[PDB]
Amino acid sequence: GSELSERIESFVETLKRGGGPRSSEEMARETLGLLRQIITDHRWSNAGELMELIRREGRRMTAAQPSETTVGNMVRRVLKIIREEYGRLHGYAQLQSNIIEAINELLVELEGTMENIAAQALEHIHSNEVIMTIGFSRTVEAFLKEAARKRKFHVIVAECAPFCQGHEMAVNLSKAGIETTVMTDAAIFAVMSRVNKVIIGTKTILANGALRAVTGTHTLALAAKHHSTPLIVCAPMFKLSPQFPNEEDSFHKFVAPEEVLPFTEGDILEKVSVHCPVFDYVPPELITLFISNIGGNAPSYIYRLMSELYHPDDHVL
Amino acid sequence: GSELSERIESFVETLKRGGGPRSSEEMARETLGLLRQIITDHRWSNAGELMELIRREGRRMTAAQPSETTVGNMVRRVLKIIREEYGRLHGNEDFSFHYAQLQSNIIEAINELLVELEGTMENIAAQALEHIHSNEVIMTIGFSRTVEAFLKEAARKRKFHVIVAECAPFCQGHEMAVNLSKAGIETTVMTDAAIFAVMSRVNKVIIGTKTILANGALRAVTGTHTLALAAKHHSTPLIVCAPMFKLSPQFPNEEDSFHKFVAPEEVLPFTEGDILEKVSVHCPVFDYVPPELITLFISNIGGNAPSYIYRLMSELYHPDDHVL
């Protein structure tokens, strides 16, 4: 049925224009949902045609919004899954159900990724600690909230400056008696001297471990490498991607400059070329320890996960 | 009078045998009392002859115990006092221009210096409250009575954890931590094999020091180099709570026997046995903290970066007295 085209186009449109959803994992699951819908309801002879088709829709879905790359690496992982199924059926008839059950098992693993990471938490934290976290990510909120039922500590969250989501995260955390304190972002280094380990979220984790976080993190990662306190990058294994740092500044996402300098100012808005990015690169040499849905990792080792998750060839997509 | 002779000789004997008296400020006060005795019981009428006299005892002393910089730089400072008063009265040659007036002035200046030297713990203690903001974890090391006075003064209006390593050659951190907890500071003894594991969780590193050189670099009770090197790897701010007389104007590698090796019995007691034949045991007591790890000397005049310490030489010791 041609309702598949409607799913595709509505997905694309709600990808470009508005932010939906908020939990990135929900975008992951609905990317996989649309992908299953694609990978049944369309005609193909061999798996080659299916790979070509998936790469076509993936190119469109990524050039749609190249900063929100969750969906891009989801398309890449589904391409890896079809490659695996073709290998198992080759060393043209029934691989469809195999691919579908593999995608289903992938969705199964994706449901409980926050619970995996939560279960992992209680080890890395210790009592009477002082953690800092930037912005608001659901993974970190779980990680802190559920592992604060056994051990009491503090968390110095920093209100991110363009969109003070740190406020929402701080209220969510302090609705669990966790002692969250909200500092304006500017004063990160003012207290990055009394912080025992920093736990940041992410939006991606490039091939070499260089994450890409809510703006105001490269400052946090530098102010950590200064005092040599370790960044704990709580980040599920679908927030990875085989892209490498070079992205011709489509890397960042450049939101409407109405956030920093409001349109209600005056004439000074004709000369001033206001900037407001939201995503900051973080080099792999300040990160200490990733927390994937399989376990802890050292930043370097991240590259290996790539060769075991996304096929090396389909990185151009 | 030969009484001065026997006193000086007993003094240098005590210096060679074993520290006397123990407290560094007490040794500086004793050195000054002796030096004053020289300026009341010897034959001099010039200033040059007195400078030669003072150098003739100071060489003996600073060659007795090369790690007693207290008495050495105290002799240097009395020399500076001589230079200053003789130059202001008469005035580069020193001549016997005048007489006892100079000696009365010298005794008065030495009395003032000694009074400033006896009330320095209280100065730094009153300077504490501004530094120890509540809920710190102040990591000391060893037992330096100035740092104990500093901390048990600052903890009369705030509250903060206090890690204290103990010096492993021979443990004195224990007595400091016991004296601390008898004032209720919530202190934490530990052997200094763990200065790097329990440093990430430290806010400010408050160390004493035996002697501040003229790089800012100091010579402090052992294992404090590695504490400073860790607390600079973790970029916490050091605080060298040293009064102003623990300040020799030598320079780091301009001194041999920098350290002070003590009887290796403490590191590997004699009870050990045969294996004491083929092992060279070293018990360095003092270690050389370079000047770029330190941050803030807390002297009786206030706080000072290390890059101000050199100026203190130019304002305390004459440039031709850095060889005593």
Q: Strand B204-207 to strand B138-141: parallel, antiparallel, or no bridges (unpaired)?
A: parallel
Q: CB distance B200–A228 less than 8 Å?
A: yes
Name, in order, each residue with C-beta under 8 angstroms of A179's C-beta and a sequence gap of 6 or more. A152, A153, A154, A155
Instruction: Look at residues A194, A169, A211 and name the one whose alpha carbon lies nearest to residue A297.
Output: A211
- A228 chain-B contacts, CB cut-off 8 A: 200, 233-235
Name, in order, each residue with C-beta under 8 angstroms of A96's C-beta and a sequence gap of 6 or more. A39, A40
Deposited resolution, Å: 3.8
Q: CB distance A226–B235 less than 8 Å?
A: yes
Residue A41 CA to residue B224 CA, distance in Å, equals 72
Give me the sign of the Cα torsion angle A170, A175, A180, A181.
Answer: positive
User: How far is the CA of B17 from the CAs of B21, B70, B258, in angstroms?
Assistant: 12, 17, 18
Across the beta sheet with A154-159, what order do the strands follow? Answer: A180-184, A154-159, A130-134, A197-200, A231-234, A287-292, A295-297
- B163 chain-A contacts, CB cut-off 8 A: none
- On whether any CB of chain B is under 8 Å from the CB of A194, the answer is yes
Per-residue DSSP letter, A241 = -
Strand residues in A3-69 grouped as ranges (E): none
Q: Tokens 């879905």, residue? A: A61
Residue A274 burial (C-beta neighbours within 10 Å; 0-12, 13-18, 19+): middle
Q: For Cα atoms B147, B149, B150, give the angle at the middle one, nearest 5 degrees.
A: 60
| Residue A244 half-sphere exposure toward CB, CA atoms < 13 A | 5
Q: Strand B286-289 to strand B218-221: parallel, antiparallel, or no bridges (unpaired)?
A: antiparallel
Residue A239 burial (C-beta neighbours within 10 Å; 0-12, 13-18, 19+): buried
Tell me how long chain B is.
324
Residue B252 CA to residue B84 CA, distance in Å, equals 28
Across the beta sheet with A204-205, what order do the strands follow? Answer: A204-205, A211-214, A279-281
Strand residues in B162-226 grouped as ranges (E): 162-166, 187-191, 204-207, 211-212, 218-221
- On whether any CB of chain A is under 8 Å from the CB of B134, the answer is no
| Residue A255 half-sphere exposure toward CB, CA atoms < 13 A | 18
- A193 chain-B contacts, CB cut-off 8 A: 203, 235-236
User: Of all helices (H) and strands (E), which one includes residue A77?
Assistant: helix A70-88
Q: Strand A279-281 to strand A211-214: parallel, antiparallel, or no bridges (unpaired)?
A: antiparallel
Residue B190 CA to residue A244 CA, distance in Å, equals 46
Both ends of chain B: CA-CA distance in Å?
25
- A229 chain-B contacts, CB cut-off 8 A: 200, 234
Residue of A nearest to B199 (CA): A196
Both ends of chain A: CA-CA distance in Å?
26
CB B304 within 8 A of CB B315: no
- On whether any CB of chain B is under 8 Å from the CB of A128, the answer is no
- On whether any CB of chain B is under 8 Å from the CB of A202, the answer is no
Phi-psi region of B237 (alpha: psi -120 to 50; beta: other; left: phi over 0): beta
Q: CB distance B200–A226 less than 8 Å?
A: no
Residue of B nearest to A130 (CA): B201
Q: CB distance B236–A193 less than 8 Å?
A: yes
- B233 chain-A contacts, CB cut-off 8 A: 228
Partner residue opposite A228 with nearest CB, options B201, B203, B233: B233
Quote the longest CA-to-CA distance of chain A. Answer: 69
Q: Strand A204-205 to strand A211-214: parallel, antiparallel, or no bridges (unpaired)?
A: antiparallel
Residue B150 CA to residue B127 CA, distance in Å, equals 8
Residue A254 CA to residue A49 CA, distance in Å, equals 36
Instruction: Look at residues B60, B51, B107, B119 and name the one whose alpha carbon lies nearest to residue B80.
Output: B51
Strand partners, B82: none
CB B258 within 8 A of CB B220: no
Q: Tokens 């003032």, residue? A: B112
Q: For Cα atoms B159, B220, B15, give the angle at the middle one, nearest 5 degrees.
A: 120
- On whether any CB of chain B is under 8 Å from the CB of A226, the answer is yes
- On whether any CB of chain A is under 8 Å from the CB of B201, the answer is yes
- Can you state the percent helix, strand and coil of chain A, rounding each to 5? 45, 15, 40
Residue B27 CA to residue B7 CA, distance in Å, equals 14
